[PDB]
Paper text:
Synaptic complexes of α-amino-3-hydroxy-5-methyl-4-isoxazolepropionic acid (AMPA) receptors (AMPARs) with auxiliary subunits mediate most excitatory neurotransmission and can be targeted to treat neuropsychiatric and neurological disorders, including epilepsy. Here we present cryogenic-electron microscopy structures of rat GluA2 AMPAR complexes with inhibitory mouse γ5 and potentiating human cornichon-2 (CNIH2) auxiliary subunits. The core of each complex is a Y-shaped tetrameric AMPAR with a three-layer domain organization. Auxiliary subunits are membrane proteins that associate with and regulate AMPAR trafficking, cellular localization, gating kinetics and pharmacology.
We also investigated whether ZK affected the closed-state conformations of the GluA2–γ5 and GluA2–γ5–CNIH2 complexes by solving structures in the apo state. We found that the ZK-bound and apo-state structures were indistinguishable with nearly identical conformations of the individual LBDs and ion channel, suggesting that both structures represent the same closed state. ZK-bound structures are used as references for further analysis as they produced higher quality structures. Expression of endogenous CNIH2 appears to be weaker than expression of the engineered GluA2–γ5 fusion construct, as evidenced by the presence of GluA2–γ5 complexes in all collected cryo-EM datasets.
Numbering used by the authors:
A (entry chain C), C (entry chain A): 392 to 548, 569 to 775, 784 to 822, 833 to 907, 919 to 1035
B (entry chain D), D (entry chain B): 392 to 549, 569 to 775, 782 to 820
The structure:
């Protein structure tokens, strides 16, 4: 008997060169699925085979100008090339001229998506419902409400120093019952409206955290092309010379009618060439792209070097492979028995598990975890760590009691003139709110910057985007506007009015310390500046967030906004006045009650 | 054969010039609805056509100085055209000189407004989950337990629950976590408890409704008809300044559109638009305070454009139709007339509208926005307005304390 | 000139008889849209008309066996019957043989659904998240935890009588801070685990109420047939001889492909005949049915006697009406001008508003309302009303102090022997849980009853469904089972063990009142029976709700379950023992401390 | 012409007898997939067919005593049939005597389990929103603040915060609303506060997650492959007792299905089903503890039946195919073979499967269930188990109190 000439193709893992090639000869240079399958069929049939490799590169098709065939179907029709144990898809136009055996493998068009890519929660992730503008104004709040209870209970009739009134503050905001209670009509109103502050913020934090966790459950990963059909944020993709595209056009099923419709009319080109590109467009387009393989390919890609892509769903259609006997040869019935005999003993299921899975280098809670609430354990430990430090402080302060007024004047004076400074500096030095925007250039994740600002209150000015050194002023301007100075002008200007009263009557109490009521009314007008700082900065940011929601989203266009060093200086100026507003009023108590 | 001269005019999506309009032939450079329609009419009737975009540039109207038709009607009557497969609107003065054909598309005057996007919060927008009748029935019951806890604790010991205290312990209860002036009576056992159960169910109804308020974002349009747009005065009207739309409101006598005309009669921020595409941007810029009135073919197309910014609301105010015209006496007049119906019966005219308006278009067919300081804004105002009101009454207190 | 013969049809509101007919003559017997339109056209054209009414009944069609026409199109072809001002739809098969004018009215296939039918919230609607099994076991809880604090603080070392411990109970469950606190290691554990009870129930009530209000917003009313296409709980309906059905078959639009698919293969028959039936199938099939009219009909039905149906969506297709001139008559061009002249002046828009709307007898908050939370105002008022009643009680009890032990023995003894009774009665008398089930017969809202039970614990027995008088027993049974006695047997049996100790040592304290510690340990074993009653009834219902969730829904099949008089007797037996468990222990305190 | 005798067998949805099976003709009384398939094969090839439901009633197999084919293969070979448009499965022993045709439907052995319906709660099911690592890190930090509040308040006054109290005030804090043994030190200002902020964020994470736990009901299947069904022992295997499915697991040598065969070898509650429709009810009755193994055509059909109670999970274990058979040498063998492919290329075979399995079927393609006492069940058990533990230690307390 002669040597039957097998004609496979260099496609992995079907036929690929052995690593020790250019050192071997003939049919013991190849390895793969079809090399093991050729060895199986030959034992059953009676062969003594000898593999070659397909001439041009191709599987088989009919050139519509000359009606010649090309490739494996080309070689076996035209006199050359016997039995064709190879990934040759059973179509109608091939089996008119050649004989296919029964399918040794059942493929189909399937969906490739990148691996669901877990998105590990941050340390301070619990403070995601309330934004960081809200968390910093709460710190301004329970400091400030403590100072008012420092005032209004030792103002006149008693147990509400800043030591005790921050305890009211840290007490009531964290919803636990405060031990003591005020006893004056004005003392209750502070405890009255602060207990309304906590009941809204906690009911806004819980309700928005239930808005995060519900929508996160409400989304769903792709598990079918029916699921892909509704979706428009994950774009499809097909090879554009071949049977994957050919399926969607002439299909009449209503889902594939909608799927081709999107692919036909979209931008940019989703009709990829050269499948290695299509695999790449899945990987560097995270959760935005979905390429459509043939099922025996994307099960191979999945069990291969880094396991980045994954098959989801079921076979959209059904097809097969087949050994391709020439047209009427005597190797057409014994091969057709030697496929069905291997597909029952389990050899065709063993050789798939071998090359796809076993020679593949890869692998095979509806509840909050510790990583979600992680910062509150670190605030707890970071809190208790601060507590043991202050346990040293009271032990040393009592030890000095075992074994000054001028310092109290020293604290109040210096904290005042820095509070006079850092507000007046900040309103003068134009380094408040930093607006930033631009549009996107795709495929590069661009850096469009063109526009910016560095605007304060009065001297609003611009830096890039024609670069405009002579920018604008409060004198009438001519499209963006700036509602910062438009509404929140008097709220720092009345703050300066209370604060100018503050340092002068402090100095009146300084130059002649026997004056008592002067330092008293000095302190009263310190906190009324600091309360104007609160309604200043709140109405400040609220005017910005109203300008934020006026965006009319514009998905491509991006934005950015950051606070400047002057916004920090007025935030620091809140601390300097208020913590002097306690020391000025406490200085009255040490002075006048001694008198 | 005869090479029928088909006239059209350049408006989207009826005839749009393809990007190869400098490197292709006449019948292959134009795309659109009328391009797909002229292929279907020629397929059923049977002729050869070459698209002949109008020389003047208008649809058609009489000039009552020289009595000469202009535009596409002008090419039909005088001789330079043979069919007019285009968006000619069937009117009386056009009907006297040419022959239309049994409308292939039914349009009407409609309402164009800006998209209902997410809006600005108020300074009392945290009172949105619980309605206004519940907030007042709490306060009227806050005074209710206040007068009970006084009349209980004054009549029973025969007095740590006067006007001063009984108003307070109810406030200390509903604004949560309690207060240390606990009642002491078996009535006060109840007076404590049954107000305290009223604390639980309101706050659990405030939290749960606000969670549903933030999960399913379900926005609505301000106006949804000409009726609701008639009674309002906030959102401004708008119409073209010389056309069939402005003429429609003038002579109408059903007294609803006459009300809409009496607004636009005075109307002095100049609501009338010149050159419609200006009025498209006028809706986009004027913050949903402006409502332009278009034909319902342009409203369904501009809605399907980038930037997605406008939406049609309501039913068609009137009904007018398009029509494949033919000259006053021709051989095409009857076979086209049965061809326009036969496309409509099979669903071709319903598919070609679906393709160009809805399929070949933008805007397609949950982002978990965190809360802003503008959402909870007035709570800071009530807080500082509480703290400021404390220092006033303390200054009142210090007055009569030192005086007495 | 002659008298042109108009041929309309008795269809409302187009042509219908005037109320004063059989008293008038000719063309002044009719009224409607087409009677006003005939008067309009005649003025423009030049007529002197005379209405008749269509011969057989019909509009016009071609009988496919004999090719004769029938009706209005029948009469105007065959020599009779001039101008045809009537609801004659412009189709292709009519205009081949007759001339239609331009459409005077633009109809379309539209959706009819019943009015959204507001579903007014109940008085006690706030207690819908937690079911009434949970609310009654809470009442068992804060009664019981009060009795344990009645015990464990006057057990040994002080301020926790039932007067004060219900105050702990009513205090802590309603989340407000309790004034006093226990001081003993066992006293804190009661306050410890009860403060864990409230934190789960409140967090289960708030979280489930947010499950109701979100899904209620998440549903959406029908506003398009695209919205109808996804839905499967509202079934469609079409007339079955006519153009409404004819549209869905030969349509190729993907939505109408899916809409016909459902209608073609469903059960029962949704292809209604005789439109008045189809309107009726909308009305007595509340939010389950949707019939598909032609747009000029369901805008008439909507503005008509009781306004029960409503048009939603837009026109699925587009069509028209038309005056139908014969084939080549001289009344074909002046009518074609007299329609377009009326459709510009607004007369065809005036006559629609007249007959549809003006001669129609009909009309033209994303927030909780008071009706939702209504019972808590009634609990508040009903609470304060009870308070003023007890204000009389303390005033009279102090007035008797101004101006008995045997009663305390009398309270404890009688409440014990009724507690011995009503538990022993209930476990004996088989009238516990009432199961009920059956399947549904549609179109009648059936009363299937066949099966039931009246089962207690031991004597489980059956009443209907072969009626089975000899039912079953605890001796082995042979499909439903009964896990009541399977798990919750010892929890009342250990309760009898504590309770048998209870009344005997009570009677030992009765026959010789100088015995002190006997009545003490009498009381200890009263509440341990009542605590076994708690874990009895909880594990009871929890075993039922596990059997409830084993249902595997079966949408047609219904179910019902009610508690019996024996379940109430053991619930009453909880009160009788516990409220004697306070009076027995308080009797020790009055006795031994006096000694 | 020739009146081709087409054989089939009565199984759904291949050939089902229509309700007019006593008042119609042969070719109009049967409906199904093979009925629609035999119309398509006759349309492309060209002949006349009359359906000839098999006399014996089986598919086909050798009887190795008399060597006579039975069933549909028996009618083909011996002469009583001409084509076999039916669900014959292509096997080797059938291939030697007749000629199949290039499968029109690709099936495989699959896994049949009960639907994952809503399940029973546990007696500790209220610990489901917060995971098990969070509940333990609370208790380990509950002891953490306990040892801090002692070491602060013992070292500072140089003692109302011993073992007795410092364990208590942390419990009084996290189990909400506070306790009246308030700390007194600037450390105790912190020790109060930073534990109190830990109260807020956990309970707001418990409430918000439980609200998401009840809103979106998202159930999962226990097993979702043969791999996950291999490693378990809880859910029982199941296969037919004499067929190609049982024979498949026996001779398989890939060692995963060999593990599945070693279970069914011992298997003594008799897992093997006689007459498959019994095993359909065995999955329905045995509470999702039984998993039957079917061909993937029956699993996709019985899933689309009333009562909707079973679902297929996982991929096909093997791959076998159907086939329109033809006798050993015929004139129909080649034109049918190209007709089966030509239907598949056009999408006819994909549509006819879609029609009979998925369209002409039940089970279609949020009910707001209130909580039950079984949901919050163990909280009553911790409560009474707390109250019972109180009376024990009190009895311990009374012992050494009167003794000392
Ligand atoms: Na809460």
């Amino acid at each position: 008997q002669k040597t039957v000439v097998v004609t496979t193709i260099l496609e992995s893992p079907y036929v690929m060169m052995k690593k020790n090639h250019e050192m071997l000869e003939g049919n013991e240079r190849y390895e793969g699925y079809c090399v093991d399958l050729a060895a199986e069929i030959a034992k059953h049939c009676g062969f003594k085979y000898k593999l070659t490799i397909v001439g041009d590169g191709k599987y088989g098709a009919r050139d519509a100008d000359t009606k010649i065939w090309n490739g494996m179907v080309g070689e076996l029709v035209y006199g050359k090339a016997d039995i064709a144990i190879a990934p040759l898809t059973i179509t109608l136009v091939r089996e008119e001229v050649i004989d296919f055996s029964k399918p040794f493998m059942s493929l189909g068009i399937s969906i490739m998506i990148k691996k669901p890519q877990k998105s590990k929660p941050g340390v301070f992730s619990f403070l995601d419902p309330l934004a960081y503008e809200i968390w910093m104004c709460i710190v301004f709040a329970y400091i400030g409400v403590s100072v008012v209870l420092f005032l209004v209970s030792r103002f006149s009739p008693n147990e509400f120093g800043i030591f005790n009134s921050l305890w009211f503050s840290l007490g009531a905001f964290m919803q636990q019952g405060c031990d003591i209670s005020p006893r004056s009509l004005s003392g209750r109103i502070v405890g009255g409206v602060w207990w309304f502050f906590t009941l809204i913020i906690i009911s806004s934090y819980t309700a928005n955290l239930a808005a995060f966790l519900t929508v996160e459950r409400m989304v769903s990963p792709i598990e079918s092309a029916e699921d892909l059909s509704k979706q428009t944020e994950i774009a499809y993709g097909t090879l554009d010379s071949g049977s994957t595209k050919e399926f969607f056009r002439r299909s009449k099923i209503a889902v594939f009618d909608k799927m081709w419709t999107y692919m036909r009319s979209a931008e940019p080109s989703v009709f990829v060439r050269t499948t290695a590109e299509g695999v790449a467009r899945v990987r560097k387009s995270k959760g935005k792209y979905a390429y459509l393989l043939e099922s025996t390919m994307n099960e191979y890609i999945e069990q291969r070097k880094p396991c980045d892509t994954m098959k989801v769903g079921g076979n959209l259609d059904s097809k097969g492979y087949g050994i391709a006997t020439p047209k009427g040869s005597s190797l057409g019935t014994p091969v057709n028995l030697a496929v069905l005999k291997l597909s029952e003993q389990g050899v065709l299921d063993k050789l798939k598990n071998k090359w796809w899975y076993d020679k593949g280098e890869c692998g095979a809670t509806s509840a909050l975890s510790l990583s979600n609430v992680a910062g509150v354990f670190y605030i707890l430990v970071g809190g208790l760590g601060l507590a043991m430090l202050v346990a040293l402080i009271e032990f040393c302060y009592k030890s000095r009691a075992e074994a000054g007024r001028k310092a109290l004047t020293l604290l109040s004076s210096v904290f005042a003139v820095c509070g006079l400074g850092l507000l007046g500096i900040a309103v003068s030095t134009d380094y408040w709110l930093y607006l930033e925007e631009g549009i996107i250039l795709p495929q590069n994740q661009s850096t469009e910057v063109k526009m910016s600002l560095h605007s304060g209150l009065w001297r609003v000015c611009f830096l890039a985007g024609e670069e405009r050194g002579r920018c604008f002023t409060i004198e009438y301007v001519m499209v963006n506007v700036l509602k910062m100075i438009r509404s929140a002008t008097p709220f720092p200007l009345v703050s300066l009015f209370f604060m100018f009263i503050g340092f002068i009557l402090s100095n009146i109490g300084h130059i002649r310390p026997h004056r008592t009521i002067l330092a008293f009314v000095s302190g009263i007008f310190f906190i009324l500046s600091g309360l104007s700082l609160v309604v200043g900065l709140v109405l400040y940011i609220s005017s910005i967030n109203d300008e934020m929601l006026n965006r009319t989203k514009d998905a491509e266009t991006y934005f950015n906004y950051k606070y400047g060093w002057s916004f920090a200086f007025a935030a620091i100026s809140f601390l300097l006045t208020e913590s002097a507003g306690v020391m000025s009023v406490y200085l009255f108590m040490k002075r006048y009650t001694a008198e």
